[PDB]
Amino acid sequence: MPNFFIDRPIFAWVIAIIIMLAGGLAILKLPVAQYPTIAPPAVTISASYPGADAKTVQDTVTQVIEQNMNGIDNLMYMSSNSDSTGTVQITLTFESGTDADIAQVQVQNKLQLAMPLLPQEVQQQGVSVEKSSSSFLMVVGVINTDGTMTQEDISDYVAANMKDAISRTSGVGDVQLFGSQYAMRIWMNPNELNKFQLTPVDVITAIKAQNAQVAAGQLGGTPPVKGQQLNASIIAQTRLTSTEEFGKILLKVNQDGSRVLLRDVAKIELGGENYDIIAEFNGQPASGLGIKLATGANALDTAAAIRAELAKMEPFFPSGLKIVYPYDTTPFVKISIHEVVKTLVEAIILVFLVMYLFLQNFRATLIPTIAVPVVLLGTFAVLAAFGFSINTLTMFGMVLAIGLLVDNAIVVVENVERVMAEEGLPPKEATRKSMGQIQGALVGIAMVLSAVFVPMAFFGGSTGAIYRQFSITIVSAMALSVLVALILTPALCATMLKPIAKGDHGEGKKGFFGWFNRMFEKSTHHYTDSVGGILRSTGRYLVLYLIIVVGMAYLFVRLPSSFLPDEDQGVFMTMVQLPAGATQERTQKVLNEVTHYYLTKEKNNVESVFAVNGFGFAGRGQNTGIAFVSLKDWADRPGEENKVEAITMRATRAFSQIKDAMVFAFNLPAIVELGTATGFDFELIDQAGLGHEKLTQARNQLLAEAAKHPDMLTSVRPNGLEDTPQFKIDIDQEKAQALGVSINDINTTLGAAWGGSYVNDFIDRGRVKKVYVMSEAKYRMLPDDIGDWYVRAADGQMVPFSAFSSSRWEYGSPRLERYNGLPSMEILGQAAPGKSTGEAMELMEQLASKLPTGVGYDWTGMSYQERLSGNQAPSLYAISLIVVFLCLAALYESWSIPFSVMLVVPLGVIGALLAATFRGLTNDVYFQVGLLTTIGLSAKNAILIVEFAKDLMDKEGKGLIEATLDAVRMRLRPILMTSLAFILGVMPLVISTGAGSGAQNAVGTGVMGGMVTATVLAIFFVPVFFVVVRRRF
Amino acid sequence: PGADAKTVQDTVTQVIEQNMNGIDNLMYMSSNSDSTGTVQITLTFESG
Amino acid sequence: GSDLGKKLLEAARAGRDDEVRILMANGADVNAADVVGWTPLHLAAYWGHLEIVEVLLKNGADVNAYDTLGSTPLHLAAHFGHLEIVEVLLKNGADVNAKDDNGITPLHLAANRGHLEIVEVLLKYGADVNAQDKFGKTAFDISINNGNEDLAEILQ
């Protein structure tokens, strides 16, 4: 092939041009996103039962849906919550690789058939089935700054005038409203109701009759009497449209002929569908849109389009309304793309500068330089072909491969230059001889590298999906690299390279290059002198090697493992949890204190605080809240003190003082989903008839025992909520029956007044909206209020609720959990420092085996994807190592010589380990991939040293040592060239701070440490490996 | 049944249409709502 | 409400005997109550923590504290079948005939749940067999409505 193209430079250019056009086209059309899809597909079923307690939700909705989730394919497991905000969420998680659309339609179809088994009011609200994402592209806040709109006003404006146009915008896949459109709110007054012998039942009945769509028919409809001249639709009753019309709804006609109107017993207004959340943005009422990216869409294009759409809405905003962007991943992602492009470009520059320092003429430095953009372009094309995106993982995959992808054309060119200077042969003949020396090795190397990286594509679940991004990126670049070096670079060498006279090593030159050349010629003799002495004394070096191997193991065992570096993404979270039963107003006071802190003490860092009272992550309710903090641009936050980790630590420290509330700040996970790192996720399961109380006792027993092993377990805790006081009211059936009061009137009176009730729909300015009846707040606050609600008996008399009921306090759950259809309690925790998660899970199972009869357990989430997707690592590494050996044995036609190459592995790894340890970094995916690429290149360096040595022994009859010294002499320069360019090109990532520097540091330091020791140690040790292996066999 | 075109557009067509976002390969959407109470919404997809 | 009062409410409910002990030694308010007026004794009685009931009572807890609906710890203990707690409470002067806001007594609650041993104990300490709740019912009315034959005989 290199032969073929040596005599066909135009053909070689054509292949290069096609590759570049393909890449150019691919770069234009490639999706851009922060991260690709990594979590297994999950579908969530959501339902609402206004005014329902957790038990009611569970036993009339959740269990019924769960019992119907049969005959669905590829389900891994199912979980649910039922809570006292009247809400259920069932989440079904499918095998990685499952078609998310098929998963969802199978779920939704099984649900459809369970709908007739659900309560009427639940069928009314509807049950949502949706794909579960945890990432937003951005969150658009909408605020009112002149105090003329409540959050309900704003939410309704956004729904009516903003949401749909955003949902229609190019690239947006889904839009969620933070709030609701208006509902017609009827706020009832029990005193007025009783005054006219009316109940909420009469209110509901009247609304259903006087707010309705009534079918009529046609004038002159078919079949007509013939001769009919006119055909016209008849319009009869249509829905009410306004609060005034609702106020005029007729309830009663008294005996004096006077009329009771709805507005006589109720206050009537447009309001929210729900009042559980209070949202504020720097203290001002807020709503917003949570926006997700459509599949295959370009995040940067979508954000730009979203902003354009919003701007064309701006002119029609009511006064005081303002758009605000508390969360937007796009600027962060912009920084990433540019940085990596910067890195790729200066890599191209460094190859130029390095090859020019050594080769000292434009044409020679041009040849290895040109190959790089061609390889990069080809790689994008292949990525596009495999349907990958431009994302954080694939972009860093490329810079992790810079050393490998850049090395091929450097090796080809350097060797042709060396051949000319050493034999005097013309460019073309030299290129032929040169390619003869390296082509098989370069192709074998390609096979070896494939064996190293491809198995990494075959992990399962979430980590498999992450590694795959690197694996395909790296193998592609590596593959394109050899192809380009075997097709284009030799054509260019044979045609573009200036001839070199035999013996000409530039030592006669003037100025810098002359000095450099003499310096580097003498350094090479010094180098071979050392290797000479080293090979006179290989025993001690086998000892020094074992020392390195031992040290590697030591550092490795003690390097703490994580997944992906935290970043300063310009935002972070603050959790607020007040004691159980704390009211919405109490939580608002804390949130106000929180917000006020950030806006004064961190006034130079904080852009805004978005306070959401009523929202939690592991349980909603009036006693929980969240403060989402948005910071100023990174450029305005110089130094570590003004970065999220610091800010957060400071905040968490300050909020320690706050009295009856747990308040703490924290950075966002890199990938919103996955592990807490050394964390586990455990389900305690009721396997028999046990019930909530016995399950709680078993949980407390498990927790107490866990706490007794700080050495192994740390922070093991319930994910859910504790039982709380609740108000048990018993209706006396006999007394109701004796008073002639029906149980339906009693129960809709209680529920409608105290829980609220969705009656029907009305039309507000062309949009259909809900009508809710409920007691005005001051008549549903306290137990004494119960007796102020009257029900009408059959005989006309009004009977106070107190006449036929009795009440008592008791405890019950505000949030009931289930797992795979059984009652459950999720428990979170982590391995103690120094311990593995595998170890910590093993103890948990042991402790769990001692629980009361009928109590079982299971692993879910991150843990499930380890007890299954962690049994793989061993066998994949084994396949890698076996195939590497076999490729080498084929290359060298030898079962033993492959060992002299495989021995290089620890040489790069020790340096990576030392760097990460010293810098206080972790064993993360970037560290690990960097290990692989560092190993890959050093293996390659050794493969060519050994190839050259063996060739000299085989074809020139040279001695073992003589051949080894010659080889090592010839491999020194090309090895220094690649190492120099790569080590320099990676330096910026090592030291960078701010936006995305977490990942940059993670790939940078491991690579730079690994490359330093790999290049410094290998040029002395592989000579040893080759000599010792040969002697032994 | 029995609803006019305006009523059915407001309570049915727009309701469905505002949910027809974020579907792969959608080229365009067209609908009608008529005096029979009947609604048809057609979503046309990219040729492949 | 005090810092240690809250801790004691929580420890009493959780049945953390040693924490209660330490809290007692540190002067945590034994008469602390939450929003519904439950005291540490209410909680220990409800959840059946015998030793904490005893520690609390040794430490001056109001044996006849009532919540915002008129219910005492003896009500709770009797209702949830905690026999030994019921004996300790009565032994420490619990009102055997305490009526909550509904006119419901510990005998009513014990009878309603069919706790035969607790009924006998309550009768032993002078529970009024003829007391009627707000609907004019007695423990006997409850027993025959429940179709509990054993209990009906005890109440005769």
Ligand SMILES: CN(C)c1ccc(O)c2c1C[C@H]1C[C@H]3[C@H](N(C)C)C(O)=C(C(N)=O)C(=O)[C@@]3(O)C(O)=C1C2=O
């Ligand atoms: C959780 N989240 C991002 C926010 C943030 C700020 C907010 O101001 C709000 C939310 C949640 C949303 C959910 C919506 C929901 N829906 C889209 C109409 C909803 O079902 C409820 C509900 N309690 O049932 C709301 O509370 C809700 O009306 C609401 O008031 C919200 C709201 O105001």
